[PDB]
C-alpha cells in the first residue's frame, strides 16, 4: 500500500497536468 | 489497439457577413466611418467559419484550435443582437454525421436560422475531431498517451454538453446524430477510451498490478454501459457495437489477469488459477465472436502460459483448492477520468472580435 500511494498519486498528477 | 472516433458533420458555405453588416446600425449611429470596425471584423468571423468548418481536415492541433476558436466566438456573439427575439436572417445547413440517407436521392440535412443550432454542430465537430486526434496518438509513448487522454476527456465533456443543451438551444427536432441519446452514448464511449488510456499508462509505467486491475475494472464498466446503450439501436456505425462488446470483455480479462498476479504474489494460488480461468474464458469469447475487430492473440497466449504454469505447480506442490468465482472478492474500481466541462473560452488565447459591443 506504500506503492498504491506512489502509483495512484502519480496518475492523479499526470491527470492534473492536462 | 482499436479506438473509436467520430466523423465530422458536413455544413454548407454561408455568407456570415452580409446578414450582419446590416443589423449593426441602430442607436449606434456612426454611419460615417466608425461602423466599419464592426465589419472588417464581422467577416474575419465569416472567413473563420470557412476555415473552421470548410476544408477536409488536418487531424492536428492546428485545425482543432480553429474549431474551438470559432465555437468560442459564436458563443460571445449571441446576446449582442438580443436573440431572444431573433430578427437577423441567417440559415445554417448541416448534414447528419451518421445517417446515410437512402440512395433514393440524398443525405439527411437540417437547416435552421439559429445560433443555437450552429454552436451545437460546431461543438460536435470539435468533439469529433478531438476523438480523431486522440485515436491517432502513438500510445507506445508518454506524450501520445497524455494527448489521447486529454482529448478523449474533452470529447466526452463536449458531447455531454450537447446532450444537456441541444433541445433548449434548438427550436426544432434535432437530427439523430446530435439528439441527446446519440450524444450521451458518444460521451460515454469517449470517457471509456480515456479510462483505457489511463490503464495503458499504468501498464507502460509497469505500475502495481493491484492498481492496473482497478483501472481495467472501471474501464470494463464504462465500456459495458456504452454497449448496453447501443444494444437496441442502429444510429452509430456498424463497427461501434462489436468494438464496445469486445472491449468490455478485454477490460474484464485485464482486471482478472492483473488481480491474478496479486493473488500469486500473496501465495493464493487457487485464486490465481480461478481468476486466470475467467480471463481465458472472456478472451476466448472475444477471439471467437469479435475477431474481425480485435487481435487478442498475445494476451491469450500470455494468460494460457500463466494458467498452465499455475496449474502444474498447484497440482504438483501446493494443492490449493481453486475457488468458485462467486466466492472471490470483487476487484475494486479506480476512475481517473472526467467529462471536461465546456466553459468558454475553450480555445487557446481567445479574444472576442466584438469585445466592445
Curated annotation (Swiss-Prot), chain A:
It is found in: Cytoplasm, Cytosol; Late endosome membrane; Midbody; Nucleus envelope. Widely expressed. Expressed at higher level in heart and skeletal muscle. Also expressed in brain, colon, thymus, spleen, kidney, liver, small intestine, placenta, lung and peripheral blood lymphocytes. Disulfide bonds: none annotated. ISGylated. Isgylation weakens its interaction with VPS4A. The modification Phosphoserine is found at residue 17. It is linked to Cataract 31, multiple types: An opacification of the crystalline lens of the eye that frequently results in visual impairment or blindness. Opacities vary in morphology, are often confined to a portion of the lens, and may be static or progressive. In general, the more posteriorly located and dense an opacity, the greater the impact on visual function. CTRCT31 includes posterior polar, progressive posterior subcapsular, nuclear, and anterior subcapsular cataracts. Belongs to the SNF7 family. Probable core component of the endosomal sorting required for transport complex III (ESCRT-III) which is involved in multivesicular bodies (MVBs) formation and sorting of endosomal cargo proteins into MVBs. MVBs contain intraluminal vesicles (ILVs) that are generated by invagination and scission from the limiting membrane of the endosome and mostly are delivered to lysosomes enabling degradation of membrane proteins, such as stimulated growth factor receptors, lysosomal enzymes and lipids. The MVB pathway appears to require the sequential function of ESCRT-O, -I,-II and -III complexes. Probable core component of the endosomal sorting required for transport complex III (ESCRT-III). ESCRT-III components are thought to multimerize to form a flat lattice on the perimeter membrane of the endosome. Several assembly forms of ESCRT-III may exist that interact and act sequentially. Interacts with CHMP6 and CHMP4C. Interacts with PDCD6IP; the interaction is direct. Interacts with VPS4A; the interaction is direct. Interacts with VPS4B; the interaction is direct. Interacts with CHMP7. Interacts with CFTR; the interaction requires misfolded CFTR. Interacts with PTPN23. Its overexpression strongly inhibits HIV-1 release. The acidic C-terminus and the basic N-termminus are thought to render the protein in a closed, soluble and inactive conformation through an autoinhibitory intramolecular interaction. The open and active conformation, which enables membrane binding and oligomerization, is achieved by interaction with other cellular binding partners, probably including other ESCRT components. This is Charged multivesicular body protein 4b.
From Swiss-Prot, chain B:
This is Programmed cell death 6-interacting protein. One of its GO terms (molecular function) is proteinase activated receptor binding. Residues 2-357 form the BRO1 domain. Keywords: Acetylation, Apoptosis, Cell cycle, Cell division, Cell junction, Cytoplasm, Cytoskeleton, Host-virus interaction, Intellectual disability, Methylation, Phosphoprotein, Primary microcephaly, Protein transport, Secreted, Tight junction, Transport. One of its GO terms (biological process) is regulation of extracellular exosome assembly. Self-associates. Interacts with SH3KBP1/CIN85. Interacts with PDCD6 in a calcium -dependent manner. Interacts with TSG101 in a calcium-dependent manner; PDCD6IP homooligomerization may be required for TSG101-binding. Interacts with SGSM3. Directly interacts with CHMP4A, CHMP4B and CHMP4C. Directly interacts with CEP55 in a 1:2 stoechiometry. The interaction with CEP55 is required for PDCD6IP targeting to the midbody. May interact with PDGFRB. Interacts with SH3GL1 and SH3GL2/endophilin-1. Forms a complex with SDCBP and SDC2. Found in a complex with F-actin, TJP1/ZO-1 and PARD3. (Microbial infection) Interacts with HIV-1 p6. Interacts with HIV-1 p9. May be phosphorylated on tyrosine residues by activated PDGFRB. It comes from Homo sapiens. It comes from the Eukaryota. Its main location: cytoplasm. The keyword DNA repair does not apply. The modification N-acetylalanine is found at residue 1. It is found in: Cytoplasm, Cytosol; Melanosome; Cytoplasm, Cytoskeleton, Microtubule organizing center, Centrosome; Secreted, Extracellular exosome.
